[PDB]
Design a protein around this ligand. Sequence first.
Ligand code: ANP
Ligand code: ANP
Ligand code: SE4
Ligand code: SE4
Ligand code: SE4
Ligand code: SE4
Ligand code: MN
Ligand code: MN
Lengths: 302, 302
Amino acid sequence: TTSSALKGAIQLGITHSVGSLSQKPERDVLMQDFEVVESIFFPSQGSSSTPGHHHGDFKFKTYAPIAFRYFREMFGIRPDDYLYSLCNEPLIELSNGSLFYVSSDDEFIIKTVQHKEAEFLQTLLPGYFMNLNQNMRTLLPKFYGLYCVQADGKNIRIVVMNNLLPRAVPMHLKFDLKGSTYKRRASPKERSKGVPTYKDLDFMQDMPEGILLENDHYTALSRTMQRDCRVLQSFKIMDYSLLVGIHILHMGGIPAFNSKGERLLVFIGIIDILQSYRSVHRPSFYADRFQKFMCSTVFRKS
Amino acid sequence: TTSSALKGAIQLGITHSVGSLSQKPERDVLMQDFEVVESIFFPSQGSSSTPGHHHGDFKFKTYAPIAFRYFREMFGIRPDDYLYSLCNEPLIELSNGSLFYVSSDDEFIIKTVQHKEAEFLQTLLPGYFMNLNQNMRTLLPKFYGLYCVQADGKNIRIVVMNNLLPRAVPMHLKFDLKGSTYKRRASPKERSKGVPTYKDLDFMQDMPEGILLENDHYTALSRTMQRDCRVLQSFKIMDYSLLVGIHILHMGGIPAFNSKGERLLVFIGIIDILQSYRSVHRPSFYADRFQKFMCSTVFRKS
Ligand SMILES: Nc1ncnc2c1ncn2[C@@H]1O[C@H](COP(=O)(O)OP(=O)(O)NP(=O)(O)O)[C@@H](O)[C@H]1O
Ligand SMILES: Nc1ncnc2c1ncn2[C@@H]1O[C@H](COP(=O)(O)OP(=O)(O)NP(=O)(O)O)[C@@H](O)[C@H]1O
Ligand SMILES: O=[Se](=O)([O-])[O-]
Ligand SMILES: O=[Se](=O)([O-])[O-]
Ligand SMILES: O=[Se](=O)([O-])[O-]
Ligand SMILES: O=[Se](=O)([O-])[O-]
Ligand SMILES: [Mn+2]
Ligand SMILES: [Mn+2]
């Protein structure tokens, strides 16, 4: 593939994009700063401006940058940290349409995106900002950046964001859960893997007594889901999953207890959030199912 | 006038509007909740729903209510406090187009509004929310509510908001300042009053050594203005004033020192913010003037 080609365009492109920013002085974000999109010409020779390269000519589209500065800021992501782990350390591909990549240090993921979505996102931002500034504990994905790359005619949109499941805490059981059932078992291929990413039925089968939760924790979660749903609902959004990482242990995640009885650090985050019908009540439905499902079956009190 | 008539429609209308709310349980505010507007029919007989009255038939339009609940919440305004001081204590008129009214307890003001404006406002809200959640120390007006009343054919839009200058701290000198000069002297009529509301030139005349400020305070203000301007700018907004209340003293305001040398508690807030051209650069201009003017002439460091 022209993949390594892209991997570069990213690290070349962002480093510029962001350093570019740390010139311009800080300022609050405005309803404008969302719609904006900046481009940068990256020739294989390279101006005294866009230099370097020998990799394959492109332009680097940076999106709503002042907004994403704000978001990083609020998610506590120092630019040098961001630039480093992302740009000065080789990017590593992944099996899963939509191609993922990962930071050498397992902190950051990179989905690609249907232009359909990328545009939706832009529109979401204000809505995002609001939820973010209100449900401080939201489960929604932490969107650190949005960028497009132009490879000849071709165009690649990508989003950068928090890996929910770092190598650090090693995950034993791993589930992608929706509250639905059609094809909601992990493919033969998938099950032939490490701590492979399961699914509703596999959970339901392999874990029918549930994930037990100390009342108070069960609430924080419950309410904070019910909040995230109500957002997503409102944005006519569907197919989202709760990604869950259980870790039996023989500190930056959730405390649980077992069907047997072992203590547990669990890790979650709602995902795949950009496909938006944007029927009349259908998302409103998918939210309630997702809700009842996680907050009744997948996690339970006492 | 049919004024006392209106005074009622308000207190009758809000009390319903808000109690109406304290049923529905709390929830984060969504980009939707801004656009919404609820109405309530208030007959002079009155349903078992909208009852009471003998005052003159009307409807009570309540605006973006979940947003304004949020705002009150964030400005720390407990509904019982709000309802009481506003609805269970006679409203008091005022001289100043645009009719003001005041809470018996001097906490709240009520401007009326050109439909032109009221609509602008709605649009501002998201923008408002952002600034509010970012410049915690903004000088912008604290908008507690927006309501319209329908008196026969007639329609009255009103906004409720923080009185910047309560009876509590008695204000000695009082200025309305813009950074302009045309008609920027206080009318003969006006000067024949208590601590009458002056203006640029009167300030410039009666106070040419300025309002002195302990470095650190001068900054908090300076930066926080420069922020508010940049918002307002962005909303293509003009004719705003800085309302200033100086109090010589022989604690909820700003510390200053004098041309002579007396200690001072000063009180400010940007106002008259809804008239929006919404020329190319003109607001951007009016902001910089307003800026330089307050942060150079009206307040100065050391
Ligand atoms: N933030 C994350 N942290 C950890 N793993 C993730 C994350 N995002 C995606 N993944 C992995 O990718 C899988 C699902 O991909 P997803 O994000 O749903 O996008 P997609 O390619 O559109 N899949 P779908 O559209 O549901 O078929 C998850 O089950 C995870 O195993
Ligand atoms: N929040 C407030 N606190 C104290 N006084 C206020 C407040 N708002 C308005 N006033 C008084 O009303 C005066 C100006 O009215 P303003 O709010 O500018 O609306 P307006 O009627 O549109 N005037 P303008 O449009 O500038 O001619 C101020 O100078 C104050 O004396
Ligand atoms: O997908 Se695209 O933007 O048409 O190349
Ligand atoms: O593959 Se599916 O039907 O979205 O779970
Ligand atoms: O001012 Se209005 O709304 O036309 O009565
Ligand atoms: O009356 Se004026 O010209 O707006 O200060
Ligand atoms: Mn998907
Ligand atoms: Mn005005």
